[PDB]
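Lab notebook, bench 4. Continuing the backlog of folding jobs that were queued last week. Each job is logged with the same field layout so the records can be merged later without manual cleanup. Today's entry covers sulfotransferase family, cytosolic, 2B, member 1 isoform a, a 278-residue chain. Filled in by technician R.K.

JOB TYPE: sequence-to-structure
TARGET: sulfotransferase family, cytosolic, 2B, member 1 isoform a
LENGTH: 278
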Amino acid sequence: LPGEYFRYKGVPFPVGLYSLESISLAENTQDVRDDDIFIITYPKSGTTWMIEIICLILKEGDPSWIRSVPIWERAPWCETIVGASPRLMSSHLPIQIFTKAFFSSKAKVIYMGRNPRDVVVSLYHYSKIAGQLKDPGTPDQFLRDFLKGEVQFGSWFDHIKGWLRMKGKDNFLFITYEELQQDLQGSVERICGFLGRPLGKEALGSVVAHSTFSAMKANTMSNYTLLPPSLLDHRRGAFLRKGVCGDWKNHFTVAQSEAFDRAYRKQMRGMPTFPWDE
Ligand SMILES: Nc1ncnc2c1ncn2[C@@H]1O[C@H](COP(=O)(O)O)[C@@H](OP(=O)(O)O)[C@H]1O
Ligand code: NA
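JOB STATUS: finished
OUTPUT FIELD FOLLOWS
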């Protein structure tokens, strides 16, 4: 596994987990179903968190599933070399590469968004233990590429902007990491309402408890510890790092934090105020 990028229709992808073949199949496939469910996010936004929350919702709270099966098998990524009823799938693809057949179908999509800053810190560390990804290199340089969209999947800015074009639609829910972080149980109900799958105190309360950071970091099937070191280095670090809101303040120097606001301002021009925007 090289740890290099290749490009598809102009977008950067990691060698190995992805290939021209896979991405295409995902873009141009026809297998999209009315009851299918898609989790779509930009890496390090907390996909995993959601991938679990939903798995619990599905089984009304029976941890059975999330205990027995890994996570990359409960909500399989479309674009990956090994792409996927009721089907739960996930994708990091930008709106212009995602499965087209989607747009005309009644399928459901939950876009999760995270504070761009934390997403970088989060990606920084991960890259160090990720087999498919090249090592961070100097901080600044890493931050320069992120803002420049010179990383796997391209600009975080483009991604969230493009996808948000689905806001307004009823087969599309947009939610942020911060929200789950703020009121997880609330979010759970919401994401439940969105999927036409209600739960009783018992069920909901279960999903809540089982979705918590600690809980998940405690579940082998969910903490990625079962991946082959040739993709994650267990001896070094962990996929579920801290799991908190605003760890960016402990990484960015003011200089970087300012330059970021700059780039961010000249990119999120007239976007609505996001949770994290202070
Ligand atoms: N239940 C949970 N609660 C809080 N953060 C969670 C979480 N499950 C995963 N995460 C965090 O989501 C990030 C990875 O998401 P993704 O699946 O998109 O790559 C990591 O951020 P950190 O590096 O800050 O710990 C990870 O710890
Ligand atoms: Na690496």
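OBSERVATION: Residues 82 and 251 are 35 Å apart (CA to CA).
SIGNED: R.K.
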